[PDB]
Design an enzyme around this catalytic site. Structure first.
Site, mmCIF file in Angstrom:
data_model
loop_
_atom_site.group_PDB
_atom_site.id
_atom_site.type_symbol
_atom_site.label_atom_id
_atom_site.label_comp_id
_atom_site.label_asym_id
_atom_site.label_seq_id
_atom_site.Cartn_x
_atom_site.Cartn_y
_atom_site.Cartn_z
ATOM 1 N N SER A 200 0.898 -0.957 -0.044
ATOM 2 C CA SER A 200 -0.042 0.017 0.019
ATOM 3 C C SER A 200 0.929 1.315 -0.134
ATOM 4 C CB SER A 200 -0.971 0.009 1.143
ATOM 5 O OG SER A 200 -1.926 0.875 1.050
ATOM 6 N N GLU A 324 -8.713 -5.850 -4.080
ATOM 7 C CA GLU A 324 -8.069 -4.426 -3.621
ATOM 8 C C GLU A 324 -8.939 -3.344 -2.861
ATOM 9 O OE1 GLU A 324 -5.061 -3.670 -2.967
ATOM 10 O OE2 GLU A 324 -4.150 -5.310 -4.142
ATOM 11 N N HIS A 437 -7.282 -6.090 0.657
ATOM 12 C CA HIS A 437 -5.943 -5.215 0.593
ATOM 13 C C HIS A 437 -5.154 -5.539 2.012
ATOM 14 C CE1 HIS A 437 -3.872 -1.481 -0.618
ATOM 15 N NE2 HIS A 437 -3.610 -1.200 0.568
#
Ligand SMILES: *[C@@H]1O[C@H](CO)[C@@H](O)[C@H](O)[C@H]1NC(C)=O
Lengths: 533, 535
Positions: A200, A324, A437
């Site tokens: 990230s 995601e 994620h």
């Protein structure tokens, strides 16, 4: 006094701890200071090298987590708490950790440096998911992770000013990389083989180190997991950073010099209190204080920089997870919650898109809705829910990643791409979030090898596979096991063939085109929709 | 009379008709060809509404096709069957308002369902006498009464000064309406049931059918409708009043010409002069655009077709609609650089970008960008075969497939019984190259049952296939349902609904049911693109 746990770095002596990994001991050096504490008049300012110390500094324990928002959306729920600070908060947080094999390696060993995510507003190198013992033990990897300032403390910029130049969190990282060049040999790490990896915002940070020349002399290879320097969230303009900084100051009761002096007089938690009241629109996957296009650390926008850069003697591994965007929806998209199945309506979806793509005009939002509506099942709640997830994941991750992979490959890099598709059996998030994620990290770090975590045998073998890909990449720039034929080869990503591999329980499968049509929509069309309109 | 075949002597409102016994494969049919339904629209009557044919005396010979309405004759490929099959097959004359009737032989005892064909040809060409419109097979094999009519095309049928007395526009449509009236009054003379009249047409014929659906005075004249690869809505079937004024005035300039004075001047021009300049009046370089088409006059068409299908009450309406596999392929050889019948037409990305500008001549820069974006395969963006097929798809979808989806969707949502098809069988006898697939217009020969003529060299499976299609169509004419109410073995053709979006494949294989008519892609043309073009 175990002499394997005692090391001399440029600043003095350290004493680590011998930690137990499943297949044997590892030497851990935790909470090694790399900078002067960035406190008092040093808040908002670039880090300076830690001054030397006397005697033996105790490096057997994780140091403080950098001052940050703590998450309260779902108190006591493991799915959110695993990302929450697990040591005391403090502005005095500029510390790094090193894991090496025990005994410490005989020859110079490739170094992996981890850079956590957390939206540039949270994170810490001390979370269980970033535990370096397995990589150190199983693969013989010297693993380094560092804390870097986040939120206002790391990223509040009054661009052009002396007292808040911006990007200090990124400089914190750079200093830790510098620290690695100068000290890692003492641990038997090879400063000539340093691979960065991150997820990230950590991935965006890796990408910025790629795009910032003075960082380039400090690593040889990079891994960007579910994040990129380009895209909607990772950077803001000078003008935009100034505005949020100005807005936050006013919000806490505060000429650049004078404004910053006042911000420096405020208790940490005061700044964190109003951190979230500066975003221009109601929005998920958007973060108040992030790296700034300063014409310094970043000479131009990442977009400009990846379009024109020369990436020839550079290897990059990039990828995404199957879902995601799911994670983010529950943080302010009406209709989404971890607790039910979050089957939304059409109306909830159109409103959801104005939040997921907060920068979008009415027209652009409409373009999005019409692209993501499955026209055979226009009002199906499952479809709409999954599509919302997809809108956010594509906009923020998959398509920026595809965009990066493309540009890097065109411009001389060696690129390997993946999609991660195994949902951890231990996932506490509901089924509809899929592979959210961040839920690949535990696997890359090798957590399933800890038999007390109740990961399946299969998941343990999977984790071993991944640790091998990542470390083979660190070792060689190529994730393929240079002793193997059974299981297909992982081919480089190219603009022609667009080949990437699925990472899941089955052997590698090669696929072509990473959301090619949909990312054409995001990367080619939507810009034009806003640059003309 | 006295010595003539007593089955070929019929009387209609305007007089007596001698027909001809025709040989079809399974036996004889009665054909009454070239029956006038209108006063010849000549001299002072050019551009004017059709006036009903004044009764004649004696027995009118109705044994041959009559003149074809004055029109542009396609020369692109001399000698070539693929283009000539569509070219006039009788003398070109402004005196062309005749119609044809095919009935069983002997004529049926009880009243039988009437199918009325309205031919296509982009509103600039066509004739009810082309071989592919031969009504004999439907007449012989299904006991149908088939009627087809000539209507004025090009300037003669469509040049309009909207608001004027002397060229109100849509007169071609009024020719069609007059023949529908003639059928109402006279068809029972032939054993036709005026209370069971199905309109069917293809391309501009289909668009024509749809405008009769949309225009109240035509509504009383038929009961059921088939629209083949064409719709009243979409980018080509109509023009605004302003644009028709513009095109008409410009055409007038080009030939040497207060509306009265201008129209009066146009009426002094030889027919061939008008044809010579009819293509010089289009605003952009285009394919699938035609100069003189139905105009939104606030009379025949009270609003735009889009507006009328969006808000119309189609409760009673039974409609059969569909498309061919490759609607667009034909049009690409008529002025997209790169494309031709004589090679594979593998094109470059450049030729694609240019083709999109021509195929979608109304698209702004951003709009065309969107099209290109949508139809590019980003795995192989430079592949000449994809780019060729994509170019076809663009033209096909924009002009036909998505208009049909918009139509089917709106009609279903508003009370219609809609049946939907995609015709995917390529004639074994097709003379167009393989790359064109199943081009626009190439289902017609099958619906009309030409393959039943063993002299035409269709395969046996095509013969069985044609019969199947003739069955679907005439059942639909008979009942509002293409299904055979006996044959429950055969897979059923479900209506098309907004809920399930069902349509059927038509090919040599038994019926397959599919869902969604280019649903994703047509959401781009039908929902997104308009909104874009409000910017
Ligand atoms: C059909 O086939 C026969 C084969 O003997 C041939 O002589 C004739 O020319 C063909 N006619 C057509 C319609 O092409």
């Amino acid at each position: 006094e175990d002499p394997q746990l005692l090391v001399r770095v440029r600043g003095g002596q350290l004493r680590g701890i011998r930690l137990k990994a499943p297949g044997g001991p590892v030497s851990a050096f935790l909470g090694i200071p790399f900078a002067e504490p960035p406190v008092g008049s040093r808040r908002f300012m670039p880090p300076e090298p830690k001054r030397p110390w006397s005697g033996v500094l105790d490096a057997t324990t994780f140091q403080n987590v950098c001052y940050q928002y703590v998450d309260t959306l779902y108190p006591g729920f493991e799915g959110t708490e695993m990302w929450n600070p697990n040591r005391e908060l403090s502005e005095d947080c500029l510390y790094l950790n090193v894991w090496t094999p025990y005994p410490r390696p005989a020859s110079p060993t490739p170094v992996l440096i981890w850079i956590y995510g957390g939206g540039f507003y949270s994170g810490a190198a001390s979370l269980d998911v970033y535990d370096g013992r397995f990589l150190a033990q199983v693969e013989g990897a010297v693993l380094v992770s560092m804390n870097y300032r986040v939120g206002t403390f790391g990223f509040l910029a009054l661009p052009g000013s002396r007292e808040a130049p911006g990007n200090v969190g990124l400089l914190d990282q750079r200093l830790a990389l510098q620290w690695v060049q100068e000290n890692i040999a003492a641990f038997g790490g090879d400063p000539m083989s340093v691979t960065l990896f991150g997820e990230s915002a950590g991935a965006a940070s890796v990408g910025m180190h790629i795009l910032s020349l003075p960082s380039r002399s400090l690593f040889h290879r990079a891994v960007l997991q579910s994040g990129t320097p380009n895209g909607p969230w990772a950077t803001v303009s000078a003008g935009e950073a100034r505005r949020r900084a100005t807005l936050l100051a006013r919000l806490v009761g505060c000429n650049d010099t004078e404004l910053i002096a006042c911000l420096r007089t405020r208790p940490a938690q005061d700044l964190v209190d109003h951190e979230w009241h500066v975003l221009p629109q109601e929005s998920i996957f958007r973060f108040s204080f992030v790296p700034v296009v300063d014409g310094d650390f970043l000479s131009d926008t990442p977009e400009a920089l990846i379009n024109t850069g020369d990436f020839q003697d550079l290897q990059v591994l990039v990828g995404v997870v199957k879902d995601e965007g799911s994670y983010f929806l529950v943080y302010g998209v009406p209709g989404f919650s971890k607790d039910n199945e979050s089957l939304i309506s059409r109306a909830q979806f159109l409103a959801g898109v104005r939040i997921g793509v907060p920068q979008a005009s009415d027209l652009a939002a409409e373009a999005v809705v019409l692209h993501y509506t499955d026209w055979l099942h226009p009002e199906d709640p499952t479809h709409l829910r999954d599509a919302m997830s997809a809108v956010v994941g594509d906009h923020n991750v998959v398509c920026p990643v595809a965009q990066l992979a493309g540009r890097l490959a065109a411009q001389g890099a060696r690129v390997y791409a993946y999609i991660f598709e195994h949902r951890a059996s231990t996932l506490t998030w509901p089924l509809w979030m899929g592979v959210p994620h961040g839920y690949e990290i535990e696997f890359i770090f090798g957590l399933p090898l800890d038999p007390s975590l109740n990961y399946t045998t299969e998941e343990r073998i999977f984790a071993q596979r991944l640790m091998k890909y990542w470390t083979n990449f660190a070792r060689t720039g190529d994730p393929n096991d240079p002793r193997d034929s059974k299981s297909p080869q992982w081919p480089p990503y190219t603009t022609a063939a667009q080949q990437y591999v699925s990472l899941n329980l089955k052997p590698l499968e090669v696929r072509r085109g990473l959301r090619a049509q949909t990312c054409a929509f995001w990367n080619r069309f939507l810009p034009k929709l806003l640059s003309a309109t």
